[PDB]
Design a protein around this ligand. Structure first.
Ligand SMILES: CC(=O)N[C@H]1/C(=N/OC(=O)Nc2ccccc2)O[C@H](CO)[C@@H](O)[C@@H]1O
Ligand SMILES: CC(=O)N[C@H]1/C(=N/OC(=O)Nc2ccccc2)O[C@H](CO)[C@@H](O)[C@@H]1O
Lengths: 304, 120, 120, 302
C-alpha cells in the first residue's frame, strides 16, 4: 500500500539550507524513507507573506531541491500556510494561492499541502457571512485548491485542532473535525500531531478515536524530536511512545525534528528502524534501546 | 468586512534598547532588565491597590519583551535575528511565563538547566 | 625527549551513548543522565562511604568533559558546530558541579535563567 | 602617534566567514577604527595543525580577504599560536614556523603576531636543556621570527601570563614577565587582557604595574564582550570598565567579541565612541555611547 514516511521541516527558527536539504534526502533514501514535507514556519513566502511569489534564485534553488528529491527518490511535498491573513470569501485571494502553487508546480512539484495550525478559530465578517463555520471555510478552499491542482496523489491538510489537547470541546464531539471528516474530499490526507502537540505516546486507542471523527486514517506530524519551544534543549533519544501497531492504522509519520540539523541522525535513523520493523503488517517488533545502539553506531562513522 | 492583511511593524529604537538591557554585560544587567527583576521579586513578595497597578505595568513590560521578538522576527533582514534567535527566543518564553504567573498571582532548560537549579 | 606532537583521541561509541543520554527525549532523561542528577541531589543533603560515591561522581563528571574534548578535536567540525551550544553548556555545567562536590568533602546562565529560577 | 584600535577575532568556536569579515572591515572603516587581528582558535592552520600550509583555494580566499582589508583601510594582522606541540630548540620546527609565515607574506600580509596564550607552562626535555626558563624559549623564537620577517612595523606577542591573575608571585614580581620585558625586542608589542581574563575593570594603575615590568605600553586584548565560555550568554551592552585615561598609556585596544558575529555591532561601535572621545593624549559615558550604537544599528534591520 501507500505510506508516507519521512521528515517534515516544519519548525520555527533558522530554516535548513537547500545544501543540508539535499543531504537529508540521501540520508532518508539510505534508510528506505520516502517523504519530505516543505513547511519551515519562517521562509516569508511559506507562511507570513504567503501570497508573494519566489524570485529568480529562489525559483532556481527550489527546482534544484525538487530535482534532488526525484534523484534520491524521496517524495517532495510543498506546504502552504495562508491562514493568518487569507480572506476565504474573496476569490481574488483563492486565485493568488492558485498562482502561488502553480509556480511551485512549475519547479516540478506534484505533491502539495495546506496547513491551518497556529492560527485563531475566528473568521472576518465577509467569511462569517459566506461560510457557516471556520471548518466550512478551510474545507472550501482546500477542496477548491485540490480540484484546481487536478486531484493530486499527495495532498495534505493540517487542521487548527491538530492534536487531542486542541479540539473544542473534545476529539469525538468537535464540530470542526466533524465538518472536515464529512465535507473534506477523500483524497486529501489529514495531519495529526497525536494526543498533545508534543505527544509522550500516540496510543492506538486515541488514533481510532480521531480516525473515526475525521473519517480517515491520519498522517502523523510527530513533534517528539522537535526542539524549537526550548532552544536550550536537544533530543538525541530514540523514537519512543508510538506502537508499531499504529503503522497499519495510519497513512504516514513525518517527523518534525531538532532545529539543529546534524542532531537529527538518531531521530531519523530510529524512525526508519521503527517503520521498516512493522512495514507490511496489517490489522515486540521494535525496541528503542536497541534502535538507539544501532543509530549511535551508524552515527559514529560521520565523526573521523 | 474582509480579514486584515498581516503587517509587519518595524523594530523600534525602544525594542533595541530593551534587547540591550536584556543581554547586557558579563558583570552587569541592563537597567531595564535589572528593574524588571526587582519588580518581579517584589510582586512575588505580596498578597494595597498599588500591587494591582504595578503588576499591570509589569505585564505591559513583559508584552514589550514579547513584542520586541515579534518585530525582530518580522523584519526583512533575517541574518541579524537568526544570529541571536537562541538567546532572544528564550528570554521571550520565560518572560511569557513570568507575565502569566503574575496574572494568576492576582487570583526546562535541559539537564544543564536542572543542575544549575541545585547550586546556590 | 622533544615536545610530543599534537594528537586527537577519536570519538568513541561510549561517548555518543553518554551524549544521547544527556540530551535524551522531551519527557525522559537518559539512564546515565538521571543517575548523575540523583547523586548530586543526595551529596547536597549530607555534609560531614559518602566520599567514595563523590569520587565516582567526579569520575562521571570528567567523562562528560572528556566527551566534549574528543567531540571538538574530531575531523567533522560540521556535526560539532550544530550542537556546540549544548555540548559546551553541558561540559561547563559539569565543571562547576564537580568543583562543588570537591569543596563539600574538603573541610552564569544569563537573565532569562535568573527569571526561570524564581518560579516553582 | 600610532594606536592599534579594532577587533580581535580570537574566540573558541565556529569562526567567521569571508563575507562577515569583509563587512567587519566596512564597519571598522566607517567607525574610524584601524586594526584587525586574525586569531580564530578553531582554524586548524593557526593553533593545533599550525605547521600545515594553506590549500590552493584557502590561499586565494585569504588573499582576497587581505586585499579587502587594504581596500577598507584596515591593518591586517596574522596570528599563529604554536605553543601546544612546538619544540622551541629543534631548528626544523623554527624553520617550519618561518616557512608558514612566508606563505602568509605571499598573500599580501605585512603585520604578524606570535600567540602563546592557553598553553602548558612546561618546556619538553629538549627545550629544558637548551633554554633557561619558559619565557626564554618563547622570547628566543619570537625575536628570531621578528628578525627573520625583517622586523615588521606591527609585530604582536601574547604571553602565557596575559592577565593579572595568571601571574605568580604577581605582575610586579613575576620572573616570566621580567624575562619578557627584558629580553623581548622593544619593536615587538605585548598583548594584555587586564587584571583578569574577562576584566571587569582595567584600572590605570593596573596598566602602570604591567607597563613597568613588560617595560612598554601594552596592546589590550579585550574579553569584555567575549562570549565563547557560555553559548547561553549574549553581550549587547556598552564598552564599560575602561577609562579614557588608559588611551595615552596603551599602544592599542583589540576587542575579542561575541562568537555570534551580527551581535557585535554595539560592542564595536561603542569601542570606537570610547577611543575617538580621547585619542589625543567624563568624555565617555557607556550608557550614552549605547544609545548612539543602538540608533545606528536600528537602520540595518529594515
Ligand atoms: C502541526 C504543528 O505541530 N505545528 C507547529 C506547532 N504548533 O503548536 C505549538 O506551537 N504548540 C506547542 C509548542 C510547544 C509545546 C507545546 C505546544 O508545534 C510545533 C512546536 O514545536 C511546531 O514546530 C510546529 O510548527
Ligand atoms: C589572550 C586571551 O584572552 N586568550 C583566550 C582566553 N583564554 O583563557 C580562557 O579560555 N579563559 C576564561 C574563560 C572564561 C572566563 C574566564 C577565563 O580568553 C578568551 C576566553 O573567552 C578566549 O577566547 C581567548 O582565546
Amino acid at each position: 500500500r501507500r505510506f508516507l514516511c519521512g521528515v517534515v521541516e516544519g519548525f520555527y527558527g533558522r530554516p535548513w539550507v537547500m545544501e543540508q536539504r539535499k543531504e537529508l534526502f540521501r540520508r532518508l533514501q539510505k534508510w528506505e524513507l520516502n517523504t519530505y514535507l516543505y513547511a519551515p514556519k519562517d521562509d516569508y513566502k511559506h507562511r507570513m507573506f504567503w501570497r508573494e511569489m519566489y524570485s529568480v534564485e529562489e525559483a532556481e534553488q527550489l527546482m534544484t531541491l525538487i530535482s534532488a528529491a526525484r534523484e534520491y527518490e524521496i517524495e517532495f511535498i510543498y506546504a502552504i500556510s495562508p491562514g493568518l491573513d487569507i480572506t476565504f470569501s474573496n476569490p481574488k485571494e483563492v486565485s493568488t494561492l492558485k498562482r502561488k502553487l502553480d509556480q511551485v508546480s512549475q519547479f516540478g512539484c506534484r505533491s502539495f499541502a495546506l496547513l491551518f495550525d497556529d492560527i485563531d478559530h475566528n473568521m472576518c465578517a465577509a467569511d462569517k457571512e459566506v461560510f457557516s463555520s471556520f471548518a466550512h471555510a478551510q474545507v472550501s478552499i482546500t477542496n477548491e485548491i485540490y480540484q484546481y491542482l487536478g486531484e493530486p496523489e499527495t495532498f495534505l491538510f493540517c487542521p487548527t485542532e491538530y492534536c487531542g489537547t486542541f479540539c473544542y470541546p473534545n476529539v469525538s464531539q468537535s464540530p470542526y473535525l466533524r465538518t472536515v471528516g464529512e465535507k473534506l474530499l477523500p483524497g486529501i490526507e489529514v495531519l495529526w500531531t497525536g494526543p498533545k502537540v508534543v505527544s509522550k505516546e500516540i496510543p492506538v486507542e486515541s488514533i481510532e478515536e480521531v480516525s473515526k471523527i475525521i473519517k480517515r486514517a491520519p498522517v502523523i506530524w510527530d513533534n517528539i524530536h522537535a526542539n524549537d519551544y526550548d532552544q536550550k534543549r536537544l533530543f538525541l533519544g530514540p523514537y519512543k511512545g508510538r506502537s508499531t501497531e499504529l503503522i497499519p492504522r495510519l497513512k504516514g509519520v513525518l517527523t518534525n525534528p531538532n532545529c539543529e540539523f546534524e542532531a537529527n541522525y538518531v531521530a531519523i535513523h530510529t524512525l526508519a528502524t521503527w517503520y521498516k520493523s512493522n512495514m507490511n503488517g496489517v490489522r515486540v517488533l521494535y525496541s528503542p534501546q536497541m534502535a538507539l545502539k544501532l543509530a549511535l553506531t551508524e552515527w559514529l562513522q560521520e565523526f573521523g | 468586512m474582509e480579514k486584515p492583511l498581516y503587517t509587519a511593524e518595524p523594530v523600534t529604537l525602544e525594542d533595541l534598547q530593551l534587547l540591550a538591557d536584556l543581554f547586557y554585560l558579563p558583570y552587569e544587567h541592563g537597567p531595564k532588565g535589572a528593574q524588571m527583576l526587582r519588580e518581579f521579586q517584589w510582586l512575588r513578595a505580596n498578597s494595597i491597590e498599588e500591587w494591582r497597578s504595578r503588576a499591570a505595568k509589569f505585564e505591559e513590560m513583559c508584552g514589550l519583551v514579547m513584542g520586541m521578538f515579534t518585530r525582530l522576527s518580522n523584519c526583512a533582514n533575517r541574518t541579524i535575528l537568526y544570529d541571536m534567535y537562541s538567546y532572544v527566543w528564550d528570554i521571550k518564553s520565560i518572560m511569557s511565563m513570568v507575565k502569566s504567573f503574575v496574572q494568576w498571582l492576582g487570583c526546562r532548560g535541559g539537564l544543564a538547566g536542572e543542575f544549575q537549579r541545585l547550586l546556590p
